[PDB]
Design a protein around this ligand. Structure first.
Ligand SMILES: [Cl-]
Lengths: 245, 117, 248, 123, 246, 119, 116, 244
């Protein structure tokens, strides 16, 4: 029902990449008619829609892209912009039918950093957008972050699980420490909502997910036990920045 | 010194030509690309475009001109555009010999044996 | 800081209204200057703001109003109109800080039926509003009913536990059984959303509170085990519509 | 019978009955017309409303069509699209028993008086 | 019935210290047995309890300590830590009977900067604490900052009147500009409270105090005339701060 | 930052009881202790200051002691406070002052004792 | 197809509240702005108002105020003209500098130029 | 005699605003108290009264407004509405003392289209109103268009000489080609009047203005040399429209 070339590039990206070697598929893809803008626009869409790939095989797509741009420069910038675009659009529409689609995109963005396609500045800008875009600054729920919506946390942990272990030396070391403190406050904003009672406690899977990611990144750091401690940590962090010029 | 700006949440039925006309006169630029909607997110189609300004001081006027500018689709629904710094600020900076030869390949040829009946 | 009249009314309704002081307080309330438009309006506000009363003392104010209308016929209408207004506004505003405020309101409406302040049509009209207002007909989530938002379930179960036990004879029995068919479909619309996974399941507390109320109402209830089964129940019920409406 | 009580809700809080009576004039025949102000307890969400009971249960079609969605404006100029639907409680105050003898006699009460003694000392 | 040596120290600091006799007092304190830990502690506490000295002679104690550290290197650190501690404890306790005492401690902390005993960071770190410690981020009244409690403002102004004149050059100037942006928002949280009405208005004496110190420090600053104007100015600041963070 | 303050302790704890209660104790070149001054009648608390060699033992030290409830002799609970001291300067080694301990042999002190002799 | 209508050639000494009374009951509308007379043409002073109706199908009736005789306090006919506004755009919804001219060095230099 | 802030905006608009000082005037205009309805009211009136500006510097005011609406979008709407009001009212009043005042207003409307403040439709509806409003269809003179009154021609050429060169591609091409037919007939209605004698001929100055203007827009056409020709071209135009 679909053209044969289109089905072939899909067979390479969504099937052959988790089975064979990335080089076998890379040269196969270099031989595609890249001068034809029709097929080029199609393969880019296939890579952006990485939700069709097995979650554990997504790094193969980043590895492949890192090499394919040595021969098709513009495809690299187009997929990255698309991935970052779908991460934004996913937050705006915020529909449950796109949750697995959005988790993969976040994972893909993390693997694109591991293979040096984007730099930490892009990853930290995306990390903050998860805890700030559509978020009322007073901590009140809003349309884009309703009270019982915890998907922002699952996105932050998805990215931190894939490339946060490399933010432990030099500049990126403390930029991650600074994002975490703002993330712990966002966490406690949600925990402090009235919807969480004794019979309806905070989802325990989210608590385990947060403690696990923090345990890996910073083993010696302990999540706060109150909202006041989190509001202090941010107040102390930004206060010291205001004092150091 | 950021120079790449994105115009997103445009109507899906819009193309590059009516965009360039609407934003006429386009401030000078070495990069100007337009991207259509994904179609797999059926209810939420939005096209977008990227412009890399040569003088990163002309975007203050550009951002105040078109950030929020209401675009119209066929039926007449309002698509207020969004003009921000592109979240990825890199742009396209011999030729390959394999380009355009996949039809003369054994792996592709054998695949056709599987796909056609 | 407050007028003495107003604070006295607040002590009467929020502090002095025990289970056996109802009559004592009613006679204290008959003495109020009801010809004054200001204090009357204020007293009605106090009764609508029922969240200031302890949950288990809410039936007391309903009992109070049932007797107070024998001498002030108009105050009965004004309180119910405000309670039904606040229930609807709660759904339109839908902020967590008003949850206890809205649970108490739903309780009040249930008690007002027990003391013959409203008829069963009011209670059912409101129950359907919990499962239809702001709800998309396809089951998809919306702005007034986000995916993980299950407060409508707790409001429906708050009313059914308060007065649903009186819907088991004659017309009032079938009118409830038809609602529960629609209620079960709304429940299964929530269960079948993508947010609920194997690690983040449908809150068992909500499952528990649903089963407890239906067991309390219809012990033989045929609990739908799927979304399709609840949809069939609705489709079969709508067949009954069009024979009793005259179109099939 | 047929429904006859109509509610006009989600009106601006700063709207008075005279202001509404002018914007609605000339409203059809009605035995009941009451206006109710905002509550203030839900401080961010103040809305006034009115209730009208029509004599002919068919002039509502015209009235609803004229005001269901009508935009009201406050001092700041924010828009308040009104909601005009059947009131969820169809009963109204009916003219009628003998007046109550104790109405307005709380000031001449010992329990109250004692309360004033205790409330006189506050803060 | 006080021991002889102790009363002599109290006479030196609270009575004999009158601006001009400072060198004579310093040499008299150098002769004290500093290696006796007990006597050292009492002397340090005498300087921490600065409320026993006349307000306009408080700077004298700071000058004395500036010369005393040329011979007892540890006492300079001990007094500052004691004063900062007394400031924080004053906020925690928050009882009006200690108000005049807490105003003296702020003056002393201000004078300690004028005599190069504390760095610029300690002053602004203490200033911010006045506007944040025990303060809810939404501007709502709290246990340590009730509605009619405006002592925090009086403390901010006592320090800015003592050493704000020297925050006019380079980085120190920029630090003060940022703090004032936060300080004005705190002021407007207090004004917007429910307790201040037409019959119970915001004390005009506090308004006059605020405008005076601000006009003395920055004569060209535009005062915020609304709680919205204050919240906008703060968001504009932290908007520029996050870009340099990451 | 390396200096840490231990404050809101019991007024009766002396330094070695603190040093005992705070065992094990990471590396620290600075360890000052301050009791409570009698003056402030109702609110008497002792405190301590510690400058850690490697500024990272505070992450382990704070969580171990921040909130540690101490007890007074009469049986009163004292939730402790652990935070970075607001003044981050410490003492360093140095010649001594010749006048130290000479006040007893001074005329001005002598004539004061005379006026103080007759209470 | 249009929705913006102009009510022009009104009396100059007319205010908006008075006009809203004469027009009562107006059809629904998003836009209703009133503009007094300019004073630059003393002999030819006319106020006007613009309305943007929500339903573009009720203008035919409102048009059929076209010729409405408005009167001033002194007494004189001002037959209002109701036509489709020649410009059919209305603005519908902040700057940081708004209201900063008082604290400005060029305007302060101007005050030195104009006050003395 | 006038408050200082009012005299300042007059200095910015009627003196300081030359071709090169627009950038400094804009930022200075953004700081005015736009929340005060009285100041903003007066500002709009100052711009509508474009006759106070040097004719050749009028385009600067349009450019100023084009950027001033990026921060005060409401003000551009009222300035245009006021300009169109004064164009219409100028025709209804029609006194020679307001001629250069109305010439300046017509110029302003043209420049407002150049900086994309009004669409082509607003320009053509005004162009036709000059040749129709107050004009009797049978060609005879009327109260608002007496015989020797040729100011409509002077107005039309004022607008076409400032933005008509931009009407030669696509839709706006046909629209203008059709207005010139009705304009040619109006011109000939005025030429065919009995007031023009040998010693009192049709003003040669105005006819040169017609030839010069039409030369700049469309070099492919010369004005009709006869009234009947102009009538024939209108009849042809309307017939071909009805048939297609
Ligand atoms: Cl105070």
């Amino acid at each position: 029902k679909r053209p044969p070339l289109q089905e072939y590039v899909r067979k390479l990206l969504y099937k052959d990449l988790s089975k064979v070697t990335t080089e076998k598929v890379l040269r196969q893809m270099r031989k595609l008619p890249w001068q034809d803008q029709e097929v080029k626009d199609y393969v880019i869409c296939c890579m952006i829609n990485i939700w069709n790939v097995k979650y554990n095989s997504i790094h193969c797509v980043a590895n492949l892209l890192a090499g394919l741009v040595l021969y098709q420069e513009d495809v690299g910038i187009h997929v990255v912009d698309g991935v970052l675009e779908d991460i934004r659009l996913g937050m705006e529409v915020n529909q449950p039918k796109f949750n697995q689609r959005r988790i993969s995109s976040a994972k893909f963005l993390g693997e694109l950093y591991n293979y040096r396609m984007v730099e930490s500045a892009v990853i930290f800008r995306t990390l903050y957008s998860f805890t700030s875009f559509g978020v009322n600054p007073d901590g009140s729920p809003s349309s884009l972050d309703p009270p019982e919506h915890l998907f922002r946390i699952r996105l932050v942990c998805t990215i931190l699980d894939t490339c946060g272990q490399y933010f432990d030396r030099g500049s990126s070391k403390r930029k991650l420490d600074c994002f975490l403190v703002y993330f712990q406050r966002y966490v406690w904003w949600k925990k402090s909502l009235e919807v969480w009672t004794k019979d309806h406690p905070f989802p325990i899977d989210i608590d385990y997910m947060i403690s696990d990611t923090l345990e890996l990144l910073r083993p010696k750091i302990k999540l706060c036990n109150s909202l006041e401690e989190s509001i202090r940590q941010v107040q102390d962090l930004e206060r010291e920045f205001l004092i150091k010029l | 010194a950021l120079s790449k700006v994105v115009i997103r949440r445009l109507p899906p039925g819009l193309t590059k030509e009516q965009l360039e006309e609407q934003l006429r006169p386009l401030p000078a630029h070495d990069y100007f690309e337009f991207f259509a909607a994904d179609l797999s997110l059926y209810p939420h189609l939005y096209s977008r475009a990227y412009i890399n300004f040569r003088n990163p001081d002309d975007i203050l006027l550009f951002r105040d001109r078109f950030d929020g500018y209401i675009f119209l689709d066929s039926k007449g629904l309002e698509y207020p555009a969004v003009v921000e710094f592109a979240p990825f600020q890199k742009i396209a900076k011999k030729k390959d010999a394999k380009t355009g030869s996949i039809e003369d390949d054994p792996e592709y040829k054998k695949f056709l044996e599987t796909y056609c009946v």
